[PDB]
């Protein structure tokens, strides 16, 4: 009994937007604590409940549950204006008293306005220099994580202690950035004044995260859910570097982002989209830039929530999925957006990569290889039926069931949930 | 199914607890010894058969010829330093090392200009705020900073198209010259050396994720993970900003090797019988008096190689409890017990008081630690030489009580007790 309760984790198995918001929301209906451990508002998690659609970024998807406490861990990078802008957008949607059930770890870093600006600048510069950038969301994520590593970045506890010292620190950080980009513009006083206001507003929600999570896991039994952001193949260490985000999206980030040891990690769910999508620049072996790709974008609404920019779509790729499983060790899968495939007569899924007719042994650490590989596909018969109303395993048509099995079998992990729709009820639990 | 679990050795305080000594001892029956985070800012001493080694990038297990040393993807590597370290040990007998050393191809590269920029930033800090971090000036902070920026270059990039590697190298070096127009950088010179290192290292490089995954799912093997730096030096959980730039805690094992938590077995906390730290930053139990001089002297607490004297103080349970909360230590290795062989009494910090009132947990704001008053418990010393102890019964009654004390106050069993620098100078209790 020395260990304590174990947290349940929801992670992205591909390149993001797999449906983490939907899955977390489903599992949070009876959770005591729902939390974020890494990333920032570069993430976007859609939740649909009772004909009401929510859009979360920094707020844990469970913020909807009024009887649960939403928690932002030390691994997350916070942009205060964005944080509150997100809250008010959702307030106008029925979200009430969120500030009373939201706890923020005082060790989390802060994304300053100039971090986002420098993100835009680097992106543009890298574009006019090497004719290709990363495709960042420009939310200042990379620069803030860069400031973290340098130990020059500022944290929540800093913003809450003596403001005079915080200002001095802020100014210094600001300068070091204007040096980086002499073109960078920073109204230090205007931003410190806004930050002064955010401090007051955020003060009552702040707490020591390490202690908060410890007590939660070692006192009376509680259900703790951890919502990962971004995805396995976007992981700073294991993704398609450098075309990745700047945090660990894989399982390890749960430990480093909340300060809990491995023995306090229970079920780890891998959310896998029935087909593959990507947003920024980077290799994408199964990318269909054709009628099929167009059919998946439209049927899957694959485009930026505010930007409208269409996401790149492709067939399910088992190579990245098995690789993702190697690092995350999923205990079960959530196969989402199956209904998208209701219209195809046949479905292709990549089973391996080839170079000179021979299957390569493992996923390439060098991104450039992925561009030179030939994807070996297997063609499965479609079900040409509406699974949208399916609520139980038996309601799925033979070819749909077979599709699910194909995923389980080849990954070596059992499918626990099948998504057939955007809303919370549009789900099938297999066990 | 799940596969075998790795054994982990982590620093529980502010570094230099004797991780090298522990890893060397455990590596005797290990098939694979690996590093998961950090770089050569780390310094680990191994003492065997009248030979004293000091490793930095090479896993402490490199000494065991029948085992495979592995450097994971979380480590930042400085090629020049790597081979200089390998050569300094070759002159000590380390032979065929390049035959039992594998390098993960996702590990990042610490370039010469990263080391220069490190000291440059450190010298600038001291000029502005008249206070810097206390970095080892090995460029670990700047390299990790480039990684997060996805601007840094990796092992696999080095061994791929060199023309490509060169252009990226150049852009990277320029961006750093903007940071400090004072910075030089002999681009062609450095690129030239790198092209050479590329080949020298190429045969040792492999895919880390696959290498480790197969090692844990194939024929049963014993994997040992050597941590670097320490819990209170953790980029997330340490005394930020006075910390190193990588996760020194257990989670770093997962991010630095690509293995899930279910493949993590025993996690050992190396805790020195007294506390030390080198560099700037709060140190609540620090003893700037005759006591400190005695610990530093008897404990030879001075720069492994950097040459900087370490700050010393009494054992501190506040930082050990906090470290445990984060690392989930399954057992402890209490080192340098023999340093206390002469003390009549030994104080141990049990809690911190702020304005006369105890605080509930270790503070996120390092500035608070700067004002706390430590509450001590004074224990009796044994005043006898324990250097020759090889068994629990060899320890005098009061030395045993010191061990139990630590074990009872932490709720974690002490599995090893160090009584000397050498490998045999250890007592296994469990
Ligand atoms: N039709 C359909 N849409 C789904 C399903 N699961 C999720 N979605 C939608 O697909 C999108 C997933 O993107 P996003 O919300 O960014 O996922 P996240 O970033 O992983 O949380 C959302 O708009 C969801 O409403 C499903 O099973 N069927
Ligand atoms: N006398 C004595 N010295 C020890 C003992 N354990 C370790 N040491 C020495 O303490 C020092 C610890 O520094 P270091 O090697 O940097 O530790 P690491 O960085 O944690 O591997 C080394 O010089 C060791 O030889 C012990 O039980 N007794
Ligand atoms: O520096 P960044 O702004 O993080 O961008 C770097 C790279 O990461 C990708 N990316 C970042 N967050 C993403 C997301 O999050 P969720 O799955 O949580 O909704 N879903 C999809 N792609 C995402 C971007 O497309 C880009 O290539
Ligand atoms: O950017 P860095 O060069 O990492 O310096 C930042 C801070 O971290 C400390 N530090 C870093 N590695 C250390 C080490 O490692 P081992 O226990 O593995 O031998 N032992 C002790 N102190 C160590 C430095 O003294 C400094 O205050
Ligand atoms: Mg999204
Ligand atoms: Mg050391």
Curated annotation (Swiss-Prot), chain A:
Cofactor binding annotation: Binds 1 Mg(2+) ion per subunit.
Primary localization: cytoplasm
GO biological process: 'de novo' AMP biosynthetic process; AMP salvage; aspartate metabolic process; cellular response to electrical stimulus; cellular response to xenobiotic stimulus; glutamine metabolic process; IMP metabolic process; purine nucleotide metabolic process
Any one GO MF annotation of this record: adenylosuccinate synthase activity
Catalytic activity from the UniProt record: IMP + L-aspartate + GTP = N(6)-(1,2-dicarboxyethyl)-AMP + GDP + phosphate + 2 H(+)
Modes of activity regulation: Weakly inhibited by AMP non-competitively to all substrates. Inhibited by IMP non-competitively with respect to GTP. Inhibited by fructose 1,6-bisphosphate competitively with respect to IMP.
EC numbers, comma separated: 6.3.4.4
Active site location: 17 (proton acceptor), 45 (proton donor)
Gene3D superfamilies, A to Z: Adenylosuccinate Synthetase, subunit A, domain 1 (3.40.440.10), Adenylosuccinate Synthetase, subunit A, domain 2 (1.10.300.10), Adenylosuccinate Synthetase, subunit A, domain 3 (3.90.170.10)
Pathway: Purine metabolism; AMP biosynthesis via de novo pathway; AMP from IMP: step 1/2
Domain of life: Eukaryota
Residues given in the record as GTP binding sites: 16-22, 44-46, 311, 337-339, 419-422
One cellular component (GO) term of this entry: membrane
Tissue expression from the record: High levels in muscle.
Chain positions recorded as substrate binding sites: 17, 305-311
Top-rank EC class of the record's enzyme: ligase
Cofactor(s) needed for function: Mg(2+)
Subcellular location: Cytoplasm; Membrane
Annotated binding of IMP, by residue: 17-20, 42-45, 137, 151, 230, 245, 309
Topological relation to the membrane, as annotated: Peripheral membrane protein
Assembly, per entry: Homodimer.
Role according to the record: Component of the purine nucleotide cycle (PNC), which interconverts IMP and AMP to regulate the nucleotide levels in various tissues, and which contributes to glycolysis and ammoniagenesis. Catalyzes the first committed step in the biosynthesis of AMP from IMP.
Family, as annotated: Belongs to the adenylosuccinate synthetase family.
Xref: NCBIfam families: PRK01117.1, purA
Name used for this protein in its record: Adenylosuccinate synthetase isozyme 1
Taxonomic lineage: Eukaryota, Metazoa, Chordata, Craniata, Vertebrata
Curated annotation (Swiss-Prot), chain B:
Keyword Metal-binding: yes
Pathway: Purine metabolism; AMP biosynthesis via de novo pathway; AMP from IMP: step 1/2
CDD domains per record: AdSS
Annotated catalytic residues: 16 (proton acceptor), 44 (proton donor)
CC cofactor: Mg(2+)
Positions bound to IMP: 16-19, 41-44, 136, 150, 229, 244, 308
Main localization category: cytoplasm
Protein topology in the membrane: Peripheral membrane protein
Subcellular location per the Swiss-Prot or TrEMBL entry: Cytoplasm; Membrane
Pfam families linked: Adenylsucc_synt (PF00709)
GO cellular component: cytoplasm; membrane
pH curve summary: Optimum pH is 6.6-6.9.
Entries under SMART domains matching the protein: Adenylsucc_synt
GO terms, molecular function: actin filament binding; adenylosuccinate synthase activity; GTP binding; GTPase activity; identical protein binding; magnesium ion binding
Reaction(s) this enzyme catalyzes, per UniProt: IMP + L-aspartate + GTP = N(6)-(1,2-dicarboxyethyl)-AMP + GDP + phosphate + 2 H(+)
Residues that, per the record, bind substrate: 16, 304-310
Annotated control of activity: Weakly inhibited by AMP non-competitively to all substrates. Inhibited by IMP non-competitively with respect to GTP. Inhibited by fructose 1,6-bisphosphate competitively with respect to IMP.
Keyword Membrane part of the UniProt annotation: yes
Keywords, sorted A to Z: Cytoplasm, GTP-binding, Ligase, Magnesium, Membrane, Metal-binding, Nucleotide-binding, Purine biosynthesis
Binding site residues for GTP: 15-21, 43-45, 310, 336-338, 418-421
UniProt binding sites for Mg(2+): 16, 43
Subunit structure: Homodimer.
NCBIfam families documented for this protein: PRK01117.1, purA
Similarity comment: Belongs to the adenylosuccinate synthetase family.
Protein's job: Component of the purine nucleotide cycle (PNC), which interconverts IMP and AMP to regulate the nucleotide levels in various tissues, and which contributes to glycolysis and ammoniagenesis. Catalyzes the first committed step in the biosynthesis of AMP from IMP.
Protein name as catalogued: Adenylosuccinate synthetase isozyme 1
Organism: Mus musculus
Lineage: Eukaryota, Metazoa, Chordata, Craniata, Vertebrata
